[PDB]
Amino acid sequence: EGGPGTGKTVVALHRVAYLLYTYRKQMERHGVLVVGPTPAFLDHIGRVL
Amino acid sequence: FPMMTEKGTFIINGTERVVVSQLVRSPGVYFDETIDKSTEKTLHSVKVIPGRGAWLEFDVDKRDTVGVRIDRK
Numbered sequence: 001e002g003g004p005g006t007g008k009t010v011v012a013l014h015r016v017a018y019l020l021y022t023y024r025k026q027m028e029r030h031g032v033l034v035v036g037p038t039p040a041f042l043d044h045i046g047r048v049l
Numbered sequence: 050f051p052m053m054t055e056k057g058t059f060i061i062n063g064t065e066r067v068v069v070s071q072l073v074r075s076p077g078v079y080f081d082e083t084i085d086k087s088t089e090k091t092l093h094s095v096k097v098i099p100g101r102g103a104w105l106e107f108d109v110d111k112r113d114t115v116g117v118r119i120d121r122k
Contacts, residue, residue: 029088029089029090029091030090
C-alpha cells in the first residue's frame with residue numbers, strides 16, 4: 001500500500017517475477033491470476049509484465 | 050518335516066526338487082509422483098503397504114487438497 005505516484009504496480013510485478021523464478025517448481029504449472037479494475041489496466045499489465 | 054539335503058535340495062516322493070527364491074516388493078511406505086493429465090499438474094501420493102491388512106493411501110490432488118483412501122474405499 002502506497003500513495004499515488006510511487007510506482008507500486010511495477011514494484012508488485014517485480015515481486016511477482018522474483019516469486020515465480022524462485023519457486024518455479026511449485027507454481028509454473030499453476031500459473032498466475034492477474035485481477036484488474038478495467039480491461040485497459042490489464043492491457044497495461046500485459047505491456048509491462 | 051521335509052529336510053534339506055547337503056546339496057540344497059528336497060527329496061519329495063523320491064524326486065529331487067528345489068525351492069527358488071522369490072523376488073517381491075517389501076512392505077513399507079512408498080511415495081510416488083505423477084502428472085495430472087487433465088491439468089499437467091504435479092501430484093504426489095503415498096501408499097502404506099503391509100504384509101497383511103488393509104491399505105492406507107494419502108495423496109495431494111490437482112486442486113491442492115490432501116486426502117486419504119482407507120481400505121481402498
